[PDB]
Amino acid sequence: QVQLKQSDAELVKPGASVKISCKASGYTFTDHAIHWVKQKPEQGLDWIGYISPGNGDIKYNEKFKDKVTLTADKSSSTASMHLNSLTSEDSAVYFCKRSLLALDYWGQGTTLTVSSAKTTPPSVYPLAPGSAAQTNSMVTLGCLVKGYFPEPVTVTWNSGSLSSGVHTFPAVLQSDLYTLSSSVTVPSSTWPSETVTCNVAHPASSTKVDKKIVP
């Protein structure tokens, strides 16, 4: 019955602020304080603060000074976190949770990305071998998926019909945009005699790139 349901992913510029909300359901909203937690890739969790709806008690972590304002609207059973003066270091997944010891009562999380980058589709460059000196029964090809924003992109090869022997890597940041690479390793008897295409989808720009790898 107990559910904490958060608002959708946010993407915002440096300097802006944002409101992330948390709709509680299946219990009496005033029975339990709502806590907020920040999770940044690799690094730990940071507790942000809590709001006690039936009480009005608000505690903050000094760490996030004048950065955070917590609210609640008893009418819709919703707790909110307003963040201001955002920087790219605020990019993280933010969670609400029920009580100081939450057990399984966490929200699903809200992704915040803070960036000055514009939405930009990937440019896709083919990776193919030139002539080798010896005969290889296997061959590796790839795609360099460069300069897109925001995350994510998905990559398949020959529309998924080719999936064993594929490696797609996490993106890195390169000039304020994302770059990733993908490899596929196939028998040399199947390429270039048969067509191999990397399929790149970037939902944010509604873009699909189908790059054929030619010798």
């Binding site: 507790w47 505690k59 939450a102 057990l103 460059y125 790839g142 360099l144 490696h167 996490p170």
Partner: protein
């Protein structure tokens, strides 16, 4: 603030084995401690609270111990679904604070990387860029070092690396290393080498090409 130090960022185990994850508090929190599991993408799930009480629904394979500053989560009879992230939380004092997390990984036979280096495409070059990409696929263990050389001499500037997590099917790791130059810089040199050192070989694995 109360600092929670978790022993190890990575531990290796085998299905059926027992493994323990420690967490040290920078001061006494009695038993005001919780252990959480967290899978990629998902929200945390409690395993233990009061340092030793198992939450209803959690397999009996998971136990917790300790009181004061030192706490241990133990997983007996490890299953593959358990190969994920675990962190501790102290709740004696605000701010609430958390361990940085421990990832459990599967032991498997050693495996040398399969290495492939690619020159920049002509399409990239015509746009004034030269990314040389090196894949180091399907190796184990995770620890690996990649060095680039141009005309025999080490290059550091312009390299970006990316690493996968352990593969769900074969338990290997893969890495990509990309050296990006201008077209003009690329064109001043002859030889481009990706060198990998891994415990499977006493000599580096070297893949290379010449323009």
């Amino acid at each position: 603030d109360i600092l929670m130090t978790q022993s190890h960022k990575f531990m290796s185990t085998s299905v059926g084995d027992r493994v323990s994850i420690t967490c040290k508090a920078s001061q006494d929190v009695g038993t005001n401690i919780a252990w959480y599991q967290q899978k990629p993408g998902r929200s945390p799930k409690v395993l233990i609270y009061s340092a030793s009480t198992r939450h209803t629904g959690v397999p009996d394979r998971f136990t917790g111990s300790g009181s004061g500053t030192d706490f241990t989560l133990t997983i007996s009879n490890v299953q593959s679904e358990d190969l994920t992230d675990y962190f501790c939380q102290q709740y004696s004092s605000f701010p609430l604070t958390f361990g940085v997390g421990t990832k459990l990984e599967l032991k498997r036979a050693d495996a040398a990387p399969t290495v492939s280096i690619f020159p920049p495409s002509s399409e990239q070059l015509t746009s004034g860029g030269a990314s040389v990409v090196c894949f180091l696929n399907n190796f184990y263990p995770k620890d690996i070092n990649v060095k680039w050389k141009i005309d025999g001499s080490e290059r550091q500037n312009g390299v970006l690396n990316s690493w996968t997590d352990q593969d769900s099917k074969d338990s290997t790791y893969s890495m990509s290393s990309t050296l990006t130059l201008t077209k003009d810089e690329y064109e001043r040199h002859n030889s481009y080498t990706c060198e990998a050192t891994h415990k499977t070989s006493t000599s580096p694995i070297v893949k290379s090409f010449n323009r």
